[PDB]
C-alpha cells in the first residue's frame, strides 16, 4: 500500500544544566524502529524493531556518526536563533525537525519533507518542489540565506528522491510480514451510570495497527458528532494502538445507540451496541 519513512529531531536547551540535549527517532509508518539520545553516556543509534537489527555494523556506526554531528549542529543552530531574536540565554528553547518521504503502492515518491519548528512554531520548511524554502519571519529569512548559499535544497532533494526511497523500500522488504499487516481492532462497549437521568456509553477499540481509525456513535442511524467524546489514540506498548469514544445518553434509552468502527484491517465497518 502507501508507506512513509520519517525522522524526528528535537534539540532542547537547558540553561545552567548542561549543553542542549538532542534526540532522534525513526519511523516507518506507525512503527518506531530506531533511536538516539545524546544524554546516553556513549550515545549510539539503537534498533527498536526486529527487522532493522539485521543491519550491519557499518550501518550502525554511520548512523551514530550522523546523530553525533547533528547534536553539535543543533546546539549551534539554537545559539544562532537566540542571537537573531535577541533572546536571553536564561530562557529554555526548542528546535525540532521532521523529514522523510512518502510513497504509494508502486514504490513511487509522492512527497518529500523537511521542515523546522523553533519553540513549537513553524520556522522554515522545504517546499514540495524540493527547490524553494518558505520562511516564517525575518529571522528565518536569515537562515534561508545560509541554506541557499550552501545549496542545501538540492542535496536534500537528491536524498529524498533516491536514498530515502531506497531505504524505505528495503525496510518494507525486510520487515514485510509485520509492516504490511493490518491488525483489526478488538471491540466492545462499556456502560457507566452517571445520575438518575443519564449514563455514559463507551465504545472501545484495542490492539489495532496502524493507528488511523474512526469511532462513531449513532442513534439509531444518525451520528452524534457534536456529542461524542474522543480520546487521542494511544499506543499499547506492543506496537498496537488503543482508542475510545463515549456518549452521554439518558437512563433507559441505551438501546437506540450504536457504535461504529472503521479500520483498514476491517473489510466492513463494525457495528456494536450495549
Amino acid at each position: 500500500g502507501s508507506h512513509s519513512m520519517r525522522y524526528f529531531h528535537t534539540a532542547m536547551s537547558r540553561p545552567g544544566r548542561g549543553e542542549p540535549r538532542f534526540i532522534t527517532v525513526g519511523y516507518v509508518d506507525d512503527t518506531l524502529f530506531v533511536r538516539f539520545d545524546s544524554d546516553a553516556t556513549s550515545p549510539r543509534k539503537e534498533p527498536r524493531a526486529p527487522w532493522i537489527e539485521q543491519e550491519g555494523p557499518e550501518y550502525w556506526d554511520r548512523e551514530t556518526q550522523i546523530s553525533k554531528t547533528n547534536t553539535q549542529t543543533y546546539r549551534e543552530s539554537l545559539r544562532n536563533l537566540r542571537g537573531y531574536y535577541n533572546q536571553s540565554e536564561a530562557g529554555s528553547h526548542t528546535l525540532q525537525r521532521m523529514y522523510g518521504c512518502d510513497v504509494g503502492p508502486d514504490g513511487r515518491l509522492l512527497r518529500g519533507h523537511n521542515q523546522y519548528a523553533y519553540d513549537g512554531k513553524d520556522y522554515i520548511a522545504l517546499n514540495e518542489d524540493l527547490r524553494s524554502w518558505t520562511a516564517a519571519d525575518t529571522a528565518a529569512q536569515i537562515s534561508q540565506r545560509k541554506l541557499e548559499a550552501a545549496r542545501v535544497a538540492e542535496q536534500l532533494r537528491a536524498y529524498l528522491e533516491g536514498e530515502c526511497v531506497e531505504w524505505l523500500r528495503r525496510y518494507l522488504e525486510n520487515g514485510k510480514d509485520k509492516l504490511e499487516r493490518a491488525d483489526p481492532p478488538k471491540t466492545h462497549v462499556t456502560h457507566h451510570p452517571i445520575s438518575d437521568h443519564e449514563a455514559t456509553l463507551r465504545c472501545w477499540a484495542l490492539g489495532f495497527y496502524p493507528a488511523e481509525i474512526t469511532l462513531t456513535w449513532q442513534r439509531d442511524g444518525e451520528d452524534q458528532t457534536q456529542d461524542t467524546e474522543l480520546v487521542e489514540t494511544r499506543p499499547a506498548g506492543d506496537r498496537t494502538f488503543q482508542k475510545w469514544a463515549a456518549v452521554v445518553v439518558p437512563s433507559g434509552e441505551e438501546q437506540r445507540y450504536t457504535c461504529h468502527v472503521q479500520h483498514e484491517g476491517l473489510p466492513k465497518p463494525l457495528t456494536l451496541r450495549w
Partner: peptide
Amino acid sequence: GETALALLLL
C-alpha cells in the same frame, strides 16, 4: 537510513 547532511546550519 538518515541523510548524511548532518551539518545543516540555521
